[PDB]
């Protein structure tokens, strides 16, 4: 279909490799390195297979096309990468231009080079904001030059940046080398998602959680065409409960736009035979705070208002468990409560326990990136589910049935 790294001859070749090293940070300290580790297999393969160089490029955060070295440098990533790889990483303070080109022209065999944040240049995204905060547009000649420069850095191109595969950015689709190969991470991610979406083992359970409904309509709709069961949890559930069940939800999140289509979505489900599991009980809070006073409510009792519901309750966890038990395949995108806070994490943790249990008995368990992946780190379960995705937005696009420009741009095999 598409050329992949396993099929690519890299011996004695400089490999310029787009990766997603857009890792969570604080005070320029990396807080989850999951994205970095995820790329190691492609990098090692290249090295073990005689690549002259591997030049790594990524964005970090949204500097919006202006240099932000004290907020968004990849320098910390170069440090973490050397540790993961047990090899030196040469960090360049830029990604394009004559000095970087000189550095990458003919490196000593086995050289690993990490470029500075691609997004310090407006050319990468093709638009951005000026240093005064005004929206600005990249210029075509400059974009071409930007792409040309990156292109100079390797003989062959590999994209392992699954997390960025939804972005038609210069580094992702604009590289002007004839051989453009998907990396092992890109391959792995797509395989699990394809199987899940094209050819699932059944029953196929989707667990969708999150705050709002409006932004998930395509996703729910598409998933309803694929799955056998769906759990809808988190903040989004209140919209369904209020509309469908007449529930009193207090101050819990309510999506007015979403409420308009909830019925239509449930109709599709019924028509398709998809069993919907909504929460039946809740952990309530008197305010939206980590340390709020908490209570308990049922759909029938209502949320006494305007208290808000911030986790599912024990009976919900039981129904969720029952669904998990039924499943031979699961895709989980979204926590079922405010997992960030211990008083409202219980539902999420229990579900994680169930998902882990399912994996141990052969359930194919796919965790969407973003918050759900974060939970995997938090509770140390990355090696206990089948797949923890590195791409939240990207994975969501696939789940919505969308094409990834980063994949499309690869060479055909
Ligand atoms: N019952 C509930 N009430 C309010 N918020 C809830 C909730 N259950 C979960 N959440 C919150 O939902 C958040 C995730 O929701 P959402 O739909 O906004 O994804 P998101 O904010 O990650 C989109 P983006 O990718 O831009 O960050 C988590 O931060 C969690 O605290």
Swiss-Prot record:
E.C. no: 2.7.11.1, 2.7.2.3
Reported impact of residue 264 to N: In Munchen; 21% of activity
Residues covered by region (Mitochondrial targeting region exposed following cis-trans isomerization by PIN1 and recognized by the TOM complex for mitochondrial translocation of the protein): 34-39
Activity regulation description: Specifically inhibited by heterocyclic compound CBR-470-0.
Substitution effect: residue 154 to V: In PGK1D; with chronic hemolytic anemia; variant Shizuoka
Residues reported to bind ATP: 211, 216, 235, 309, 340, 371-372
Residues given in the record as Mg(2+) binding sites: 211, 214-215, 371
Associated pathology: Phosphoglycerate kinase 1 deficiency: A condition with a highly variable clinical phenotype that includes hemolytic anemia, rhabdomyolysis, myopathy and neurologic involvement. Patients can express one or more of these manifestations, and some affected individuals develop parkinsonian symptoms.
Record-linked HAMAP family: Phosphoglyc_kinase
Entry-linked PANTHER family: PHOSPHOGLYCERATE KINASE, PHOSPHOGLYCERATE KINASE 1
UniProt protein name: Phosphoglycerate kinase 1
Source taxonomy: Eukaryota, Metazoa, Chordata, Craniata, Vertebrata
């Amino acid at each position: 279909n598409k050329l992949t790294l396993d099929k690519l001859d890299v011996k004695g070749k400089r490999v310029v490799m787009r990766v997603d090293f857009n890792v969570p940070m604080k005070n320029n300290q990396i807080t989850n390195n999951q994205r970095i580790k995820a790329a190691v297999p492609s990098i090692k393969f290249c090295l073990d297979n005689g690549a002259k160089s591997v030049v790594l490029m990524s964005h970090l955060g949204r500097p919006d096309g202006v240099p932000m070295p004290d907020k968004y440098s990849l320098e910390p990533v170069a440090v973490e990468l050397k540790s993961l790889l047990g090899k030196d990483v040469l960090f360049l303070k830029d990604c394009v231009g004559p000095e970087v080109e000189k550095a990458c022209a003919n490196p000593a065999a086995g050289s690993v080079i990490l470029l500075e944040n691609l997004r310090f240049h407006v050319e990468e995204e093709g638009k951005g904001k000026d240093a005064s905060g005004n929206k600005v547009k990249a210029e075509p000649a400059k974009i071409e030059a930007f792409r040309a420069s990156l292109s100079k850095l390797g003989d062959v191109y590999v994209n392992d940046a699954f997390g960025t595969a939804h972005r038609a950015h210069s580094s992702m689709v604009g590289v002007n080398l004839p051989q453009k190969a998907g990396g092992f991470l890109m391959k792995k991610e797509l395989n699990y998602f394809a199987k899940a979406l094209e050819s699932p083992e059944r029953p196929f359970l989707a667990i969708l959680g999150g705050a709002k409904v409006a932004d998930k309509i395509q996703l729910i709709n598409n998933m309803l065409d694929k799955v056998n069961e769906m759990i809808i949890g988190g903040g989004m559930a209140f919209t369904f409960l209020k509309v469908l069940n007449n529930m009193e939800i207090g101050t819990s999140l309510f999506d007015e736009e979403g409420a308009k289509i909830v019925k239509d979505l449930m109709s599709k489900a019924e028509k398709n035979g998809v069993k919907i599991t909504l929460p039946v009980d809740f952990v309530t809070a008197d305010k939206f705070d980590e340390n709020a006073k908490t209570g308990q409510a049922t759909v029938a009792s209502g949320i006494p208002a305007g208290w808000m519901g911030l986790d599912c309750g024990p009976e919900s966890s039981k129904k969720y468990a029952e669904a998990v038990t039924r499943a031979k395949q699961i895709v989980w995108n979204g926590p079922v409560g405010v997992f960030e806070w211990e008083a409202f994490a219980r539902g999420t943790k229990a579900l994680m326990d169930e998902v882990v249990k399912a994996t141990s008995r052969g359930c194919i368990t796919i965790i969407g990136g973003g918050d759900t992946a974060t939970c995997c780190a938090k509770w140390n379960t990355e090696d206990k589910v089948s797949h923890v995705s590195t791409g939240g937005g990207a994975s969501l696009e696939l789940l919505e049935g969308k094409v990834l420009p980063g994949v499309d741009a690869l060479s055909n095999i």
